[PDB]
Amino acid sequence: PNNLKEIEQEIEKVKNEKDAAVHAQEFENAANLRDKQTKLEKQYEEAKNEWKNAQNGMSTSLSEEDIAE
């Protein structure tokens, strides 16, 4: 429910920018992009873990409204 797509897009754009800057002979700006990508990946992993942990707390039982729908 719109939790991980936004983080995935931020990783994708940073990866594309780093790939574009590699061929441009821009080594000074690549370290910041690499650090930002690593931080984004760590945050994405933490968000995925905390999202999948919260689902096990409750049970997705079936009520009479779902069958009627």
Added chain:
Amino acid sequence: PNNLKEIEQEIEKVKNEKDAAVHAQEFENAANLRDKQTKLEKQYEEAKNEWKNAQNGMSTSLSEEDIAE
């Protein structure tokens, strides 16, 4: 005459080190390698430009010793 090779051999090591560092996810050390490569290329170009002037200035007279040899 130990003037062109001594500088040409210094380019391959720097290029290989930069290529290895790029694939090693180490973008912090690449700036120094790029700067050193640029400085070495400038020095090599200046040496190559100044080396041919002496050869062009002199005349390659064909002596009779070469025919005998």
